[PDB]
Amino acid sequence: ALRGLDTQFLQDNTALVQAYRGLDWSDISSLTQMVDVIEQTVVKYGNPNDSIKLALETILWQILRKYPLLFGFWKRFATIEYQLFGLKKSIAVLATSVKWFPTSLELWCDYLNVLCVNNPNETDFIRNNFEIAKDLIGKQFLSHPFWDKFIEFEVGQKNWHNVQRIYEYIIEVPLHQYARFFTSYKKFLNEKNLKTTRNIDIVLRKTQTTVNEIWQFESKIKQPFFNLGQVLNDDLENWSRYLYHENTWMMYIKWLTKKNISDEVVVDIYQKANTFLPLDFKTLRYDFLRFLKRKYRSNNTLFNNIFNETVSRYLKIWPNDILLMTEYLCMLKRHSFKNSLDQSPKEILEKQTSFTKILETSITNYINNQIDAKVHLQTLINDKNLSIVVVELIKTTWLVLKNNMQTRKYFNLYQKNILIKNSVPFWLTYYKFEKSNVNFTKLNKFIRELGVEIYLPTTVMNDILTDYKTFYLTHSNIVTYESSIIDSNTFDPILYPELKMSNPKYDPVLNTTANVDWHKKTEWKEAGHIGITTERPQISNSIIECNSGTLIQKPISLPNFRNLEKINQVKINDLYTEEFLKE
Amino acid sequence: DSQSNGLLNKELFDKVWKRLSCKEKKSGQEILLNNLVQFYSKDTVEFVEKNIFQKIIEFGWEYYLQNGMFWNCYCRLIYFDTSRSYLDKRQYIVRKIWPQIDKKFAQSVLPSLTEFCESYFPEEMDTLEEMF
Amino acid sequence: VFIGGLSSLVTEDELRAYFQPFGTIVYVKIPVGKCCGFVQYVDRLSAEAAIAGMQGFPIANSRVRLSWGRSAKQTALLQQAMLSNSLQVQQQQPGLQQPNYGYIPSSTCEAPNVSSTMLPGCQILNYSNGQQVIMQGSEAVVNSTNAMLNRLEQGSNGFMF
């Protein structure tokens, strides 16, 4: 994780290549190895990328230099420096040259050509095509830049109206009108670019980030959805991200839908924004799952396969989260079958019975330690997420097939399994099944065994006991009730749930030996003060229970003490210090 | 099936129906409504369909139809009935119950109504969306 | 409350479902991969009901041992000192500044106009999951029982946990 150390490792391996003076083809391949390793952790700034690009160019490996520039560009879109580099290189190419260099200029132009400081890209492009003979392509580039609000746009206008000694203003009207639009927009934007330029300052501070003025800019490019909108809003978001406030991307999520830009432009943002924004934040992540289910309305198998892969990336980064496996198994039921009740009755039941037989043999392999790369469910099935996969088997078998005896058989097998004895959704489905099939005999045994062995959380433990009380009072009668209190144990479905409400380990235990073993328990020792197991002194044969009318018969026996030495001995097992501060 | 005619008795149900009629002020409506679902049999579903879930449509009070907790409970009354097979239970809900909602209410009802569909009916999740 | 010896197969939102019912929580953290987090209530009474409540209570098949322990900021003031064994001078939690007449301890506003009688029987003031709300005695039980039936249908289909 030490980003600072991989920087220092790079700078010293780099300086021992440079100051042992050789290639050190060792020290070269070690610098390239640590630069690959750090890149694969960490998104790198355009200064890091530029130094790497510089060195590979200096040891000249043209095709690998092209691949490294590709990588460079995909972590941090205001890399107009790295585009400009990539364009000066590729202009030393060969025979696909002419159209390769046109390609990276055209791609750089669509990523950075609308940025207030993007003029050097347009100038670079123009230089190249003028260094051909290409008067029509040069004029098209002039005309394009003139219709965008760019910093020295006025100087560029002047330049094109002396350079075009050849046909200057063939249509005076159109070019000077789109320039006039341009310079209106550059004046509007000039307020915001100046409120950016007049804090943007490395102070280890929010002026460095200019985050407040970036938020102001983003808002005023969203609201002004002036069609150059679609590209302007993405450009301002990336220029803001380059100085990791995730609400900037979570404001951009809303703008694309309101503006109405196509599914190809929108999905490539969130695919990129998931990798760009840090792990563990999880706000643009879960929204993107909601988008893919919503964009499925226009049925695309493209949209299916984005969802199957976004889960498989999120499941590895967040393995404990159960929401993901519920969303995945939904789409697996949905996009694999798609019945819609316009079929034969015998056809649809096979589509569910296949969904049983696939799901049944999927869990049997995640418990016997067997992975099948064909079935995509086996790559995702996790011991945190194995529960709900078992649940939906039970939920399909009981509701869809109307099959009880197979359902009840499946409870007995999966009750004793260690991964799913302690599961919220398993037992509540057992609760919902045992509620519907009316019986209380099986259901009373559920709740009396709820703190003792079937270990749910205390917020759910109240949830059954509050609900089961209301249900028992509503559906049962006294004759049902009176036979259920056998009175070996004091258990009663009316009164027991109120007593066992917030207490998990409440036990109705009547005994006379509880009187005998008293004074040696931790409740007695840590009495008025909790945690601290002191040994309180006391008189063994206390007179204070007996009345003064009954004492006068025989004389009072002297006081037998106990534990009288430990009046000052106070012991504490400092469980915080020795297991957290000491590890 | 020896089911004690619980919340369904002329003495209590009229107290409940008088409670439901207040609609906006009595302030414990849906919690009372959610416990009317709990019958899970042939006779009692046909009762609670006709005697509350049909009459609430016929009178057509505005408050109850915009609250998606109502439509969610009306679906769960039908789906968990032991009398129906899967076919008619998938029919009776999707063919008749889903269309009886208004298109203006389908804004605020959809969130609670999707959650029933997203969990029990993944197969017919598309036919939900096109309707609204 | 320090909670030692966790399974580390458990999220914070499942741990929050063990310690919600004992009172209102001003939760602080669960550190990454250490197998031992910590929880913080607003009443002391609520905490001691939680310690005596869940001692040796298995969370995901692992008996849990729990006791008193400091917050996150004071931890860093300890972990800077434990390596440098200099002083280790503690600072106590801040007082509530008694007496507050409204607040009843160990009580929850279960979900979010109220012009109450302000009588002693009812709970006037309360804590939201940090804003001081006025609990309506009628509206409390309907909102607690609202989320009670909502949780059984979401919990059965795996959405909430």
GROMACS .gro file of N, CA, C and O in nm, chain A residues 293 327 330 333-334 339-341 348 352 395 399-400 432 436 438 470-471 474-475 477, chain B residues 3-4 6 35 38-40 79-80 86 90-91 95 118-120 122-126:
model
  168
  293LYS      N    1  -3.051  -0.325  -1.441
  293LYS     CA    2  -3.182  -0.388  -1.440
  293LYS      C    3  -3.285  -0.300  -1.511
  293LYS      O    4  -3.381  -0.350  -1.570
  327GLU      N    5  -2.944  -1.018  -0.600
  327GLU     CA    6  -2.963  -0.950  -0.727
  327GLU      C    7  -2.916  -1.037  -0.843
  327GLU      O    8  -2.975  -1.032  -0.951
  330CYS      N    9  -3.164  -1.329  -0.914
  330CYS     CA   10  -3.281  -1.272  -0.980
  330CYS      C   11  -3.264  -1.269  -1.132
  330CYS      O   12  -3.352  -1.314  -1.207
  333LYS      N   13  -3.257  -1.605  -1.291
  333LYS     CA   14  -3.393  -1.659  -1.310
  333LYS      C   15  -3.462  -1.585  -1.424
  333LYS      O   16  -3.535  -1.645  -1.503
  334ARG      N   17  -3.437  -1.455  -1.434
  334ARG     CA   18  -3.505  -1.372  -1.533
  334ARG      C   19  -3.451  -1.397  -1.675
  334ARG      O   20  -3.523  -1.450  -1.760
  339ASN      N   21  -4.040  -1.659  -1.932
  339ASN     CA   22  -4.161  -1.736  -1.968
  339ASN      C   23  -4.278  -1.645  -2.011
  339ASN      O   24  -4.333  -1.662  -2.120
  340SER      N   25  -4.316  -1.552  -1.923
  340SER     CA   26  -4.420  -1.450  -1.948
  340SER      C   27  -4.564  -1.502  -1.971
  340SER      O   28  -4.649  -1.427  -2.023
  341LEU      N   29  -4.592  -1.627  -1.933
  341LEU     CA   30  -4.729  -1.684  -1.932
  341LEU      C   31  -4.801  -1.688  -2.069
  341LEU      O   32  -4.925  -1.692  -2.073
  348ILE      N   33  -4.369  -2.430  -1.902
  348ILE     CA   34  -4.317  -2.336  -1.802
  348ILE      C   35  -4.266  -2.411  -1.678
  348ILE      O   36  -4.166  -2.371  -1.616
  352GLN      N   37  -3.893  -2.404  -1.462
  352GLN     CA   38  -3.865  -2.395  -1.319
  352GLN      C   39  -3.796  -2.520  -1.265
  352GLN      O   40  -3.712  -2.510  -1.176
  395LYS      N   41  -3.773  -2.187  -0.139
  395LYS     CA   42  -3.882  -2.097  -0.174
  395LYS      C   43  -3.945  -2.136  -0.307
  395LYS      O   44  -4.064  -2.116  -0.327
  399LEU      N   45  -4.341  -2.306  -0.291
  399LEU     CA   46  -4.440  -2.219  -0.354
  399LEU      C   47  -4.473  -2.262  -0.498
  399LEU      O   48  -4.590  -2.278  -0.532
  400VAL      N   49  -4.369  -2.282  -0.579
  400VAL     CA   50  -4.387  -2.301  -0.724
  400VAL      C   51  -4.433  -2.443  -0.758
  400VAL      O   52  -4.531  -2.460  -0.830
  432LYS      N   53  -4.200  -1.852   0.797
  432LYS     CA   54  -4.310  -1.824   0.706
  432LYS      C   55  -4.377  -1.951   0.657
  432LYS      O   56  -4.498  -1.952   0.634
  436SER      N   57  -4.776  -2.065   0.766
  436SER     CA   58  -4.880  -2.090   0.666
  436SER      C   59  -4.944  -2.225   0.685
  436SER      O   60  -5.066  -2.236   0.693
  438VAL      N   61  -5.057  -2.433   0.930
  438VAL     CA   62  -5.106  -2.359   1.049
  438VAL      C   63  -5.037  -2.397   1.181
  438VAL      O   64  -5.028  -2.313   1.271
  470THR      N   65  -4.871  -1.198   1.844
  470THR     CA   66  -4.988  -1.147   1.775
  470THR      C   67  -5.056  -1.257   1.693
  470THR      O   68  -5.179  -1.266   1.689
  471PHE      N   69  -4.976  -1.342   1.630
  471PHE     CA   70  -5.031  -1.451   1.551
  471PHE      C   71  -5.093  -1.558   1.640
  471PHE      O   72  -5.194  -1.617   1.604
  474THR      N   73  -5.423  -1.450   1.783
  474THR     CA   74  -5.526  -1.429   1.683
  474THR      C   75  -5.587  -1.562   1.636
  474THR      O   76  -5.709  -1.574   1.623
  475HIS      N   77  -5.501  -1.661   1.610
  475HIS     CA   78  -5.544  -1.785   1.546
  475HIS      C   79  -5.569  -1.902   1.638
  475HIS      O   80  -5.637  -1.996   1.598
  477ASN      N   81  -5.699  -2.080   2.018
  477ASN     CA   82  -5.799  -2.067   2.124
  477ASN      C   83  -5.744  -2.124   2.254
  477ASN      O   84  -5.634  -2.179   2.255
  586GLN      N   85  -5.989  -2.415   1.158
  586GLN     CA   86  -5.932  -2.281   1.175
  586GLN      C   87  -6.029  -2.199   1.258
  586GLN      O   88  -6.147  -2.189   1.223
  587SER      N   89  -5.981  -2.141   1.368
  587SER     CA   90  -6.063  -2.054   1.452
  587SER      C   91  -6.087  -1.925   1.376
  587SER      O   92  -5.993  -1.852   1.346
  589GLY      N   93  -6.087  -1.615   1.315
  589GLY     CA   94  -6.015  -1.524   1.403
  589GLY      C   95  -6.060  -1.381   1.398
  589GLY      O   96  -6.157  -1.342   1.463
  618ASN      N   97  -5.237  -0.787   0.907
  618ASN     CA   98  -5.281  -0.904   0.984
  618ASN      C   99  -5.409  -0.969   0.932
  618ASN      O  100  -5.446  -1.077   0.978
  621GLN      N  101  -5.335  -1.304   0.699
  621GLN     CA  102  -5.273  -1.423   0.757
  621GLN      C  103  -5.354  -1.555   0.753
  621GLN      O  104  -5.322  -1.648   0.826
  622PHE      N  105  -5.455  -1.567   0.666
  622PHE     CA  106  -5.549  -1.680   0.676
  622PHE      C  107  -5.511  -1.807   0.598
  622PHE      O  108  -5.534  -1.917   0.648
  623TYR      N  109  -5.455  -1.792   0.479
  623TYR     CA  110  -5.391  -1.904   0.408
  623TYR      C  111  -5.477  -2.030   0.392
  623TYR      O  112  -5.437  -2.140   0.431
  662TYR      N  113  -5.100  -1.515  -0.323
  662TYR     CA  114  -4.988  -1.601  -0.360
  662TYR      C  115  -4.965  -1.718  -0.262
  662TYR      O  116  -4.942  -1.830  -0.307
  663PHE      N  117  -4.976  -1.691  -0.132
  663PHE     CA  118  -4.956  -1.794  -0.028
  663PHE      C  119  -5.077  -1.883   0.002
  663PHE      O  120  -5.071  -1.965   0.094
  669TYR      N  121  -4.972  -2.303  -0.909
  669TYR     CA  122  -4.884  -2.192  -0.948
  669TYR      C  123  -4.937  -2.120  -1.071
  669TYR      O  124  -4.914  -2.000  -1.086
  673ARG      N  125  -5.032  -1.733  -1.071
  673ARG     CA  126  -4.959  -1.641  -1.157
  673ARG      C  127  -5.054  -1.571  -1.254
  673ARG      O  128  -5.024  -1.462  -1.302
  674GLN      N  129  -5.167  -1.635  -1.284
  674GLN     CA  130  -5.266  -1.571  -1.370
  674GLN      C  131  -5.347  -1.466  -1.296
  674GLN      O  132  -5.352  -1.350  -1.338
  678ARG      N  133  -5.309  -1.108  -1.449
  678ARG     CA  134  -5.417  -1.080  -1.544
  678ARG      C  135  -5.522  -0.981  -1.493
  678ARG      O  136  -5.577  -0.904  -1.572
  701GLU      N  137  -3.994  -0.848  -0.744
  701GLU     CA  138  -3.852  -0.877  -0.757
  701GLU      C  139  -3.811  -1.001  -0.679
  701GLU      O  140  -3.711  -1.065  -0.712
  702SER      N  141  -3.887  -1.036  -0.577
  702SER     CA  142  -3.852  -1.150  -0.493
  702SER      C  143  -3.927  -1.279  -0.530
  702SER      O  144  -3.866  -1.386  -0.531
  703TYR      N  145  -4.057  -1.270  -0.558
  703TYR     CA  146  -4.139  -1.389  -0.588
  703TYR      C  147  -4.160  -1.416  -0.738
  703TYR      O  148  -4.173  -1.532  -0.777
  705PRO      N  149  -3.954  -1.318  -1.052
  705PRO     CA  150  -3.853  -1.265  -1.145
  705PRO      C  151  -3.892  -1.287  -1.292
  705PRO      O  152  -3.866  -1.200  -1.376
  706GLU      N  153  -3.954  -1.402  -1.321
  706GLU     CA  154  -3.999  -1.438  -1.457
  706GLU      C  155  -4.088  -1.333  -1.526
  706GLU      O  156  -4.076  -1.311  -1.646
  707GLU      N  157  -4.176  -1.269  -1.449
  707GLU     CA  158  -4.272  -1.171  -1.501
  707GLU      C  159  -4.241  -1.032  -1.446
  707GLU      O  160  -4.331  -0.959  -1.403
  708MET      N  161  -4.113  -0.995  -1.447
  708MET     CA  162  -4.068  -0.863  -1.401
  708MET      C  163  -4.071  -0.760  -1.514
  708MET      O  164  -4.085  -0.640  -1.489
  709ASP      N  165  -4.056  -0.806  -1.639
  709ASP     CA  166  -4.065  -0.720  -1.758
  709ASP      C  167  -4.208  -0.671  -1.782
  709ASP      O  168  -4.229  -0.552  -1.807
   0.00000   0.00000   0.00000
